[PDB]
């Protein structure tokens, strides 16, 4: 199957350059264009260009001064350079597989297969990873409390990804330092409380953190 | 010029049908487009292409539920028999000469949902956190509907109004809404009250949970 995976850091300073990778698996990169998209975080899709690696390469006007696209047909993979960032643009950034064009010509429009898309945040703050605590007290809720991380996103399995029913991970609040916090909870039966052994492993890629926290009453 | 003008909303029952309008400019009335569908929280997912002459082809895996037409500049997106997990914002988005353009979505909402009350769940400080001259009460918010509650703290009975951060509702998984509040205090603040209170109101409906050091 086809499949799309964008990655690139999820932090930038302000003026600097961000850049970002569209690996693709499954099949090959060629005869297509490949476009890249953004979204604010609330705002609408909007396009940022595409390529073509044989062909051509284009931008969206407002930002053809800044965008670099290009591809490496050994990796299968499309790359695109946004330099002199700004907060604008804060915002998820996907990649899709776009127009096929044959060597004739002929082309078949398109826009079918989506990658997952990355975060990236425009900030001048550091940096910085959470600290992450146990949430303990028909069924019972037992959780991980995620804080004061910077920027966005963490990720949150549990018991190593064996617990997924009745996980739900909270939306982060955004403190007045700057700072973000979320929580973790998996709801479970009262009786396991002794029957099983619960870890929340908590994932905060900018900083590198990797931490995982046994929640037990 | 090329402009993709979609409505920013839209709405109908569930159970029920929608039409969804995505008008071209004049310079471009005659160009296919795309829908694009944007549940909450989630990436787009492509749904379907729809040309010039009105005929469309569905995405893989996309249901006979979503059809698309066409009349004159105008390029429509219908869902029948809608459903909560129908609640997306829409986008076309077309194929310009050396451009690609989207337009400014529609957020589609489904009427006609039940009301589900707030289920709460209140945590105590962690011994580790503590530990770290800390205390955070954690008050958790899941399964309701309309998505709109408020929060109220409170210690051996007063209100409690300083260090209270609360986030906005957003949809979740199980097509209910989710929110949370966090009330940070001192490891003696903590332990010189008898207990404290998170009480949540959700359509005239308050629920409390308390705990105890
Ligand atoms: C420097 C630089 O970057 N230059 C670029 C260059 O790279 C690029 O190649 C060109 C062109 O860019 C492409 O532009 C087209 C849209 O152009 C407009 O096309 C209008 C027609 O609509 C297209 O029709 C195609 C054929 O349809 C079939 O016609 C049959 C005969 O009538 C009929 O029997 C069939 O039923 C029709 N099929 C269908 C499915 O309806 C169709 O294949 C395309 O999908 C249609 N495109 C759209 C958007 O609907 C035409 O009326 C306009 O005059 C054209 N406008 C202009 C300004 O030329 C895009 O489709 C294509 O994606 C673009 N390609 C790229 C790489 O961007 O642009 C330079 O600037």
């Known amino acids: 199957q086809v499949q799309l995976q964008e990655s690139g850091p999820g932090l930038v300073k302000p003026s600097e350059t961000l850049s970002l990778t569209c690996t693709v698996s499954?099949?090959?990169?060629?005869?297509?264009?490949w476009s890249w998209i953004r979204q604010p975080p609330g705002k609408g899709l909007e396009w940022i260009g595409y390529?073509?690696?044989?062909?051509?390469?284009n931008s969206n006007p407002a930002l053809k001064s800044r965008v670099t696209i290009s591809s490496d047909t050994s990796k299968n993979q499309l790359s695109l350079r946004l330099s002199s960032v700004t907060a604008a643009d804060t915002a998820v950034y996907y990649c899709?597989?776009?127009?096929?064009?044959?060597?004739?010509?002929?082309?078949?429009?398109?826009?079918?297969?989506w990658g997952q898309g990355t975060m990236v945040t425009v900030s001048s703050a550091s940096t910085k990873g959470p600290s992450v605590f146990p949430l303990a007290p028909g069924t019972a809720a037992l959780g991980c409390l995620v804080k004061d991380y910077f920027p966005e996103p963490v990720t949150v399995s549990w018991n190593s990804g064996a617990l997924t029913s009745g996980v739900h991970t909270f939306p982060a609040v955004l403190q007045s330092s700057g700072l973000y916090s979320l929580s973790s909870v998996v709801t479970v039966p009262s009786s396991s409380l002794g029957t099983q052994t619960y870890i929340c492993n908590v994932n905060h890629k900018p900083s590198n953190t990797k931490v995982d926290k046994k929640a037990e009453p | 010029q090329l402009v993709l003008t979609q409505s920013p909303s839209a709405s109908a029952s569930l159970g029920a049908s929608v039409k969804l309008t995505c008008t071209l400019s004049?310079?471009?009335?005659?160009?296919?487009i795309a829908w694009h569908q944007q549940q909450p929280g989630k990436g787009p997912r492509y749904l379907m292409k729809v040309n010039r002459d009105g005929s469309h082809i569905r995405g893989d895996g996309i249901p006979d539920r979503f059809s698309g037409s066409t009349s004159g500049a105008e390029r429509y997106l219908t869902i029948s028999s809608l459903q909560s997990e129908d609640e997306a914002d829409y986008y076309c988005?077309?194929?310009?000469?050396?451009?690609?353009?989207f337009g400014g979505g529609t957020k589609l909402t489904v009427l006609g949902q039940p009301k589900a009350a707030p289920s709460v769940t209140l945590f105590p400080p962690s011994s580790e956190e503590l530990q770290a001259n800390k205390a955070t009460l954690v008050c958790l918010i899941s399964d309701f509907y309309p998505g709109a509650v408020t929060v109220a703290w409170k210690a051996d009975g007063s209100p409690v109004k300083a260090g209270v951060e609360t986030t906005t509702p957003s949809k979740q998984s199980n097509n209910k809404y989710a929110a949370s509040s966090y009330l940070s205090l001192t490891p003696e603040q903590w332990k010189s009250h008898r207990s404290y209170s998170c009480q949540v109101t959700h359509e005239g409906s308050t629920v409390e949970k308390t705990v105890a050091p």
């Open positions: 988005q077309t194929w310009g000469a050396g451009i690609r353009v």
């Open positions: 004049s310079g471009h009335s005659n160009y296919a």
């Open positions: 899709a597989r776009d127009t096929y064009y044959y060597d004739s010509g002929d082309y078949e429009d398109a826009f079918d297969i």
């Open positions: 499954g099949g090959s990169i060629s005869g297509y264009y």
């Open positions: 390529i073509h690696y044989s062909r051509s390469t």
